Structures are given as C-alpha cells and as structure tokens.
Amino acid sequence: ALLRILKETEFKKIKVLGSGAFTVYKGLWIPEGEKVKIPVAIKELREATSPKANKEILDEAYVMASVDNPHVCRLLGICLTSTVQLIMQLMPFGCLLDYVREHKDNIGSQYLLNWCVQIAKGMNYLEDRRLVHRDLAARNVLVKTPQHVKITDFGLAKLLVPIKWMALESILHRIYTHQSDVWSYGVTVWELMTFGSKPYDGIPASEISSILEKGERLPQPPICTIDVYMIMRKCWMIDADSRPKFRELIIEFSKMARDPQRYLVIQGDERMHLPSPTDSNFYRALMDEEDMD
Ligand SMILES: Nc1ncnc2c1ncn2[C@@H]1O[C@H](COP(=O)(O)OP(=O)(O)NP(=O)(O)O)[C@@H](O)[C@H]1O
Ligand SMILES: [Mg+2]
C-alpha cells in the first residue's frame, strides 16, 4: 500500500530541475476528480523493457516505498511505461552540495555538525533495514528545510560510476556493504566541511584506486580539527570492519554538535546560529510537519 501506481494521465512534467546518470522534473500531480494541481518531483530514468524490467523494478520499488525515516526520502509512486518514472516529494531547496556551495559564507558549525548527525541517522536506518545505499554523496542529500536534511536515491544504483565516493573494496571487487556506505559517508562529510569541494579534483577516476592503495586520502579541510578529521580518516580504512559504524557516527557528531566551535573553526561562527524556536516552528508549520523533523 506504500507505493502508488500512477497513470500517465494523472501527472505532468513541468520544468527540469537537473539530471544525472539515472532526469529530475518539477511536476504536477492532478488527483482524479479534483481541480487542484499538487507539486511533485518526478525522476525519469533511461530505457526499459516490459518483457523483463517490470517486477524487478516494481518489486525493488516496493522496498524503496517502505523506507520510513525522517532522514531518508521515501519513494511515493511509480509510472511504468516505455520509460520508468518515480514520483517523490518535491524538495524546493535542492541538494545539500549546491546548498552549502551557495551559502559558503553562511554555514555555521551548528548546521554542519547537525547535518552529519542527520545523514548518519538516515544511513543508520538503512542498515537496520539491511539496505545498502551504493551511491551516497552530498548530491544525494536533499534539503527539506535548512534544518532538516534527507538522503535520496536509495536503491537506484543497484537496480540500474562514482569512483571518488566508493570504498576500495567496491572499486576493485564491486563489493557493496554497509561498511562501504560508511566510506562514501566520510567523503560526504568532506564535501560538507569544504563547503562543496570536488573530491580528488583533477585526478582521473581511472587512477583513484591506485592512490588509495599507496595511502592518499582526502586532505583535512581547513575548518576541521583532528577529532573530526580522525573520524573522516577512520571511514576510509582499508579494512572495512575497522571503519566506524553508522550508529557510532551518530553518537560522536551528536557529542560534537553539543559544543560546535570546539570542533569546527569557522570565522564569525558566533553569529551563524540555528533558528530560534519561533523560526523553527514557523518553518515546520509551512514546510515540514514530519513527525520527527
Ligand atoms: N525530490 C527532489 N526534489 C528536488 N530536487 C531534487 C529531487 N531529487 C533530485 N533533485 C535534484 O535534481 C537534480 C538531479 O538529481 P539526480 O538525477 O539524482 O542526479 P545527481 O543527484 O545530481 N547525481 P546521481 O544521483 O548520483 O546520479 C539534482 O540537482 C538534485 O538535487
Ligand atoms: Mg541524485
């Protein structure tokens, strides 16, 4: 019941928001018998085969329609035609990568650390459900409000290549576990703490696996103390079961979000605080009524 099969005639694509490797549209759901048009997000993929890619897509979409977590985007509906179209809640703020990139001069420690906690809470839920993201990145974290981030694009990757966000065991042997997701998680934290820098900028993807084996890792971002950089460093250990668990990651960034400036050194950090409750409640009443935003 968590996945609504839609007819083509009851939703319309309107404007393109972006496109990657799996095209995302700002669209309009028209419920039958009504005069309202309800904004939705529509992701359309490449070609598809009826004699095959139907249940394979539909059965795995039911999995994606079952994720129930404040920090993981749920698939709401599907339309199975020549193409494949997935309908989800439109998030008007866009991805966290472009967000922190357009707001470099305005992301405090309280936000950054809280975003880590939220991403780890999302990722930790997927593990409790025995599910592997396969494509975690700052571009796959959506901004519902600036105070509430949600992971997106779960289970896309498996049903359909981001070398610079994959663990070595995944580049070399195509092994994808919850511990490989932790690697990608660590890279995402690096994108966030650099305000959106490209990982291994300029280095060809072909050569990433070698530099990992000789022990290149992403550099400690300026604003990071070694406590945070150590945590990052531990995500990219060669031995996957030496990497932190998502559940450990929640507790630690939570600890650090309780004294933000001791762990991140941002200029004027004292003036870029979280919203007052008043602002927070107004935000939620219009944009984010979710049970535990
Ligand atoms: N539900 C959504 N609401 C609003 N914007 C969205 C939504 N889903 C995706 N987008 C944006 O649409 C664009 C395309 O996303 P997508 O096609 O998944 O490529 P990508 O995230 O940039 N990289 P990848 O997912 O790894 O292939 C990105 O700029 C996303 O932030
Ligand atoms: Mg995406």
Looking at 30, 58, 90, which one is the last position of a domain? Answer: 90
Tokens of 166: 């994959």
CATH number at residue 20: 3.30.200.20
Q: Do 77 and 96 lie in a common domain?
A: no
Residue 39 near ligand 1, beta carbon < 6 Å: no
Residue 256 CA to residue 230 CA, distance in Å, equals 13
| Boundary residue ending a domain (60, 90, 120) | 90
Q: Specify the residue with its C-alpha closest to ligand 1, atom 12.
A: 18
Which residues constitute the domain of residue 111? 91-278
> Entry resolution in angstroms?
2.5
Do 49 and 125 share a domain, yes or no?
no
Check whether residue 85 and residue 97 sit in a common domain: no
Nearest ligand, CA of residue 27? 1
Same domain, 72 and 11: yes
Residue 225 Cα to ligand 1 middle (Å):
31
291 located within any domain: no
Tell me which of 42, 62, 90 is where a domain ends.
Answer: 90
Verify that 14 and 154 share a domain, yes or no. Answer: no
Decide: 16 in ligand 1 pocket, CB within 6 A.
no
The domain that holds 99 is classified in CATH as 1.10.510.10
| Number of domains within the chain | 2
- Considering just the CA atoms, what is the radius of gyration of the chain in Å? 20
> Is the four-CA dihedral 23, 43, 165, 61 of positive or negative sign?
negative
Same structural domain for residues 150 and 241? Answer: yes
Identify whether residues 187 and 197 lie together within a single domain: yes
Domain co-membership, 85 together with 146: no
Q: Do 223 and 127 share a structural domain?
A: yes
85 and 107 assigned to the same domain: no
